[PDB]
Design a protein around this ligand. Structure first.
Ligand SMILES: CCCCCCCCCCCCCC(=O)O[C@H](CCCCCCCCCCC)CC(=O)O[C@@H]1[C@@H](NC(=O)C[C@@H](CCCCCCCCCCC)OC(=O)CCCCCCCCCCC)[C@H](OC[C@H](CO)O[C@H](OP(=O)(O)O)[C@@H](COC(=O)C[C@H](O)CCCCCCCCCCC)NC(=O)C[C@H](O)CCCCCCCCCCC)O[C@H](COC)[C@H]1OP(=O)(O)O
Ligand SMILES: CCCCCCCCCCC(CCCCCCCCCC)(CO[C@H]1O[C@@H](CO)[C@H](O[C@@H]2O[C@@H](CO)[C@H](O)[C@@H](O)[C@@H]2O)[C@@H](O)[C@@H]1O)CO[C@H]1O[C@@H](CO)[C@H](O[C@@H]2O[C@@H](CO)[C@H](O)[C@@H](O)[C@@H]2O)[C@@H](O)[C@H]1O
Ligand SMILES: CCCCCCCCCCCCO[C@@H]1O[C@H](CO)[C@@H](O[C@H]2O[C@H](CO)[C@@H](O)[C@H](O)[C@H]2O)[C@H](O)[C@H]1O
Ligand SMILES: CCCCCCCCCCC1=C(C)C(=O)C(OC)=C(OC)C1=O
Ligand SMILES: CCCCCCCCCCC1=C(C)C(=O)C(OC)=C(OC)C1=O
Lengths: 239, 239, 24, 230, 238
């Protein structure tokens, strides 16, 4: 599938913080969405997820317009959202986290969910923990059960909001390993992190926006050899 | 400059409590006096003037309360906004916070001393005549030198409580980020409320002749003033 | 939040409930 | 299942707030010495009847507000759940609450309060069935029937109201602001019960619907905060 | 000067969060304090500042023990602190909140307060904002006012707490320009943050404290070639 936005715009009060941002996420593709802080890279992200309602855009998965829909009707078309906070179900079991969202899908019978859950929790190596709740799990499983749980809702276009976001450089390699595995199952993923050193090292395309709109949409080695990004953003030294 | 900043910032929060708390006390004055005029006197000519003439009695309790609560709002805001930590980091003690609280309690204790004599007895020498010995609501301060239930000890302690409740809020408005910002008001708001439940049950209980309101009404005023000083001088050697 | 800050709010609010029951 | 997890989180904090609000007003109800008279122990199920529409609002603001500050209220609706079937999961735990404030307001709080007032012998508040077909020979004694028959209806309104401004303007506030709002809107419900109680007979003419205005006016705020502001 | 912190310790409810960390910083020397988020670098930093009281240890600023002193008493004797978040005075002018901490210095006369304030605007390129108060100030212009008024208190050893904290990479050139400007004025800067790649480019040496005690120190070249650091931290850094 392909998830495309088209001419997205958003204005709070007079100043249009987003004008004419158009992106495209295909399947089997990490794509980044970057830029300076407050420029509108986090508003044009939430306009694709569904929290911030659009003003002039057209969010389209391959043959249905979802630009009018809220987040919960958008999450059933195949959009998955992973927030940058913890958001694990705390006083609920780590097997019941997967069974929580596997009962929402009406195309699974009541026994066909308890082997899909038994399959997801060994792909992500979270089978040795089965009754550990989640208010004290780890920092390393406050990032891997939530990916197994966001994959249990059957997405096509899982959207990562600030995945790295203040973790040690020994744990960046682990959450880069499960982003590249995430698209080996045929799954386009959109990243919007601030730490632009690994979200240009994990992605294949990037979508630099600054203060209202797109600047570049090339490969990471095409934005370093650019010039206009190098004045509002990265600088003159990045190698 | 930093003292004129703390005074101008609390005064804008103190005059905003005095408008919210005036309507809260007006409605409590409106909930009751219907119930004494729905099966009592007629509510046709008095219900708007009996409301407006009981104001200098209810301003005896909201003038110490708005300076108390206005300093919990203002000092508690600058603790969370990291303006008081960086005030100590440039180097100046907590005596600036105490010299800005007592220069602001003087502004309130000369409104609560105009209200307590010849603005308070006036509204009882006018509210009790429109209904046509041992009263102690219309006598002024010089003619309150009678015997036998002369309660001027509750008209003096409403002015001393402007000063001892401005000393206690400078070390009790320290916001801990783990507890929160309303959980940190709980040892302060319970301590002011315990002060008014003891002095009210010493003014009325000392009105019958069970215990004289000079020994026991100023023991509470001196226990709480000595509590205001050990709290303000806690940063020293252990004792 | 502490052991001495918690045991103040228990003790100080116990004396408020007694003093509400005094003047009723 | 997490229809049984929203409801389990709410029901635990309703009964934690209600036990708190009854133990607080039981030490205040230790006034009647001013030594082992247990007048305040047999008057417990009357205090449960009085504080139950307030523990419903404050306990569901406290239980849904901890689902929102732990960010597990957006992560289940970003994987499924409509905002209607999370509203239907706080009503499925409201039916055992309504079937408890009318099961002790007719079987326990009659016989517990009366056997305490007789033990302390050194609006004719009896029952919803005892006052039914009692007074015939308009007045005041029928308003105590209507403000008691759908007093269980005021529990389900306040749990709907405690959800209407969790989706509205208290999703991103600290936890202490939700408690202060829960106490402040428990003051307005006292005002609407004792100022629309008398005044709807003596300065106006609602016969039956005068007891509805406490619950009917907090239902209009609930559908104004999730529909007009959506 | 030679601010030295010796044998520091803390226990939060029995949990030993730091044991035996010894760090020094001299005048005109950037020194970093980094490591993983295991309590470590943050509680050690908040002992030298003074907003966390030590359990056992000694803080001396070159001659005298200041370990039992609060934050406002250490600020008279050198040590100056910058919080991580926005700490500018809110409804005060930029010239006014530079003068508000310049008024407390009693070793100046009232004309020398005005000469020092106009010397600090032109040093930090602020003098075009002297009547403009804050919240008309951006993220990069609020930061220069906080360093200009921490320098109005006349400190030795400005120690910064996460001075990058989320800024775009054209705005780390300008923070590292005014950090290396404090070193050229004879100030011993002590930095802690999360960003490893931008402090090991600016520090002259760095302490790595992980899991309680101090695990390594040295110049940032020989930090990268260390093997015991390389396991718990910086797997394949560069
Ligand atoms: C957003 C803003 C909105 C506007 C806000 C501002 C305006 C508000 C306007 C109305 C204000 C009050 C007006 C008034 O005027 O209040 C007056 C007196 C002035 C009161 C001002 C009080 C409120 C705060 C003002 C400031 C607010 C910012 C009395 C009255 O008017 O009543 C007087 C009446 N007493 C009271 O009611 C208790 C009387 C007690 C008064 C104390 C006064 C000193 C208070 C210091 C407070 C400091 C607060 C910080 O407090 C009351 O009223 C209080 C009623 C409201 C309680 C609200 C909840 C509080 C707890 C919240 C949770 C912590 C008194 O005793 C008879 C004696 C009780 O033992 O027996 C009764 O029944 P029973 O035993 O027969 O069954 C009483 C029994 O006990 C009891 O229920 C048990 C307890 O005690 C109850 C104590 C109160 C609740 C405590 C809960 C724990 C609290 C812990 C707090 C730390 N039961 C009732 O009455 C039935 C009511 O359902 C009780 C309702 C209680 C609240 C919850 C339920 C709400 C309704 C139902 C919802 C489903 O006899 C008087 C003469 O008649 C002969 C009579 O009249 P009068 O004054 O004319 O003489
Ligand atoms: C028993 C009677 C009924 C009420 C029971 C309420 C039980 C509430 C429990 C929970 C609580 C509520 C806030 C309280 C604020 C002070 C409230 C004072 C009310 C005085 C009437 C205490 C939690 O505080 C919270 O603060 C926030 C950061 O803001 C923290 O993040 C939370 O993690 C938590 O720490
Ligand atoms: C008409 C009903 C009104 C109900 C109460 C509405 C909320 C009142 C409290 C919230 C507004 C005041 O409080 C502030 O809100 C913003 C909202 O982004 C928070 O952020 C702040 O941390 C909080 O301090
Ligand atoms: C009926 C329930 C009412 C709850 C009211 C909560 C009010 C919180 C006000 C917070 C606030 C404070 C204290 C405040 O001091 C302030 O500005 C100086 C604000 O500015 C926008 C505030 O919002
Ligand atoms: C600190 C707890 C209350 C926080 C309210 C938001 C605080 C952060 C932004 C504040 C702010 C505003 C709004 C502002 O409008 C302004 O103008 C000069 C400030 O100046 C320095 C500010 O600090």
């Amino acid at each position: 599938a392909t998830l495309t936005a088209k001419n997205l715009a958003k204005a709070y009060k007079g100043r249009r913080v987003v004008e004419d941002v158009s992106l495209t996420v295909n399947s089997g593709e990490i794509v980044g969405l970057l830029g300076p802080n407050g420029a509108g890279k986090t508003t044009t992200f939430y306009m694709v997820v569904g929290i911030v309602p659009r003003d002039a855009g057209n969010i389209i998965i391959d043959d249905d317009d979802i630009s009018l829909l809220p987040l919960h009707a958008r999450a059933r078309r195949g959009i998955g959202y992973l927030p940058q906070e913890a958001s694990i179900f705390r006083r609920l079991s780590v097997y019941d986290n997967l069974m929580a969202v596997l009962q929402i899908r009406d195309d699974l019978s009541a026994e066909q969910r308890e082997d899909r859950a038994n399959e997801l929790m060994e792909e992500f190596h979270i089978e040795h923990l089965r009754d550990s709740m989640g208010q004290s799990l780890s920092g390393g499983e406050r990032r891997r059960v939530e990916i197994a749980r966001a994959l249990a809702a059957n997405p096509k276009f899982i959207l990562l909001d600030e995945p790295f976001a203040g973790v040690d450089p020994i744990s960046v390699i682990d959450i880069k390993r499960i982003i590249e595995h995430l698209r080996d199952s045929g799954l386009g993923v959109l990243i919007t992190d601030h730490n632009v050193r690994e979200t240009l090292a994990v992605c294949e395309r990037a979508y630099i926006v600054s203060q209202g709109h797109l600047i570049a949409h090339g490969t990471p080695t095409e934005i370093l050899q650019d010039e206009h990004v190098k004045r509002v953003y990265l600088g003159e030294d990045f190698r | 400059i930093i003292i004129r900043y703390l005074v101008r910032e609390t005064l804008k929060s103190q005059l905003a409590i005095l408008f919210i708390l005036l309507l809260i006390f007006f409605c409590q004055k409106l909930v009751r006096i219907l119930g004494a005029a729905v099966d009592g006197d007629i509510p046709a000519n008095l219900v708007l003037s009996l409301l407006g003439l009981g104001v200098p009695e209810m301003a005896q309790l909201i003038l110490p309360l708005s300076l108390f609560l206005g300093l919990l709002m203002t000092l508690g805001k600058l603790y969370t906004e990291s303006e008081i930590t960086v005030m100590h980091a440039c180097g100046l003690s907590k005596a600036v916070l105490v010299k800005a609280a007592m220069i602001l309690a003087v502004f309130t204790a000369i409104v609560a001393a105009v209200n307590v004599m010849w603005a308070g007895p006036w509204s009882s020498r006018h509210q009790d005549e429109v209904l046509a010995d041992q009263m102690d609501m219309r006598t002024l301060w010089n003619t309150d030198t009678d015997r036998a239930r002369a309660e001027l000890n509750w008209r003096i302690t409403l002015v001393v409580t402007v000063f001892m409740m401005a000393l206690m809020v400078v070390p009790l408005s320290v916001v801990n980020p783990r507890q929160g910002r309303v959980l940190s008001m709980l040892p302060a708001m319970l301590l002011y409320l315990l002060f008014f439940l003891i002095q009210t049950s010493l003014k009325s209980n000392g009105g019958k002749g069970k215990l004289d309101p000079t020994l026991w009404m100023w023991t509470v005023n001196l226990i709480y003033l000595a509590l205001a000083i050990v709290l303000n001088l806690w940063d020293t050697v252990p004792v | 939040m502490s052991k001495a800050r918690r045991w103040v709010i228990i003790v100080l609010s116990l004396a408020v409930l007694v003093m509400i029951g005094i003047n009723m | 299942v997490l229809d049984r997890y929203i409801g389990k989180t709410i029901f635990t904090t309703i009964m934690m707030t209600l036990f708190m609000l009854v133990s607080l007003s039981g030490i205040i109800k230790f006034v009647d010495q001013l030594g082992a008279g247990m007048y305040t122990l047999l008057s417990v199920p009357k205090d449960v009847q009085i504080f139950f529409p307030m523990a419903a609002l404050l306990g569901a603001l406290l239980g849904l507000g901890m689902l929102a500050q732990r960010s597990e209220l957006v992560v289940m609706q970003a994987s499924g759940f409509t905002r209607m079937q999370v509203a239907l999961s706080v009503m499925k735990t409201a039916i055992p609450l309504v079937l408890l404030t009318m099961a002790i307001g007719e079987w326990v709080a009659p016989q517990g309060e009366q056997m305490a007032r007789n033990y302390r012998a050194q609006p004719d508040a009896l029952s919803i069935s005892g006052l039914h077909n009692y007074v015939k020979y308009a007045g005041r004694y029928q308003l105590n029937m209507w403000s008691k028959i759908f007093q269980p209806l005021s529990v389900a309104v306040m749990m709907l109201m405690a959800l209407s401004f969790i989706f509205g303007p208290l999703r991103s506030v600290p936890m202490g602001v939700r408690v202060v709002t829960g106490i402040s809107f428990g003051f307005v419900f006292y005002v609407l019960d004792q100022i629309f109680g008398p005044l709807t007979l003596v300065y106006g003419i609602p016969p039956i619907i005068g007891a509805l205005l406490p619950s009917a006016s907090f239902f209009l705020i609930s559908l104004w905060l999730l529909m007009r502001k959506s």
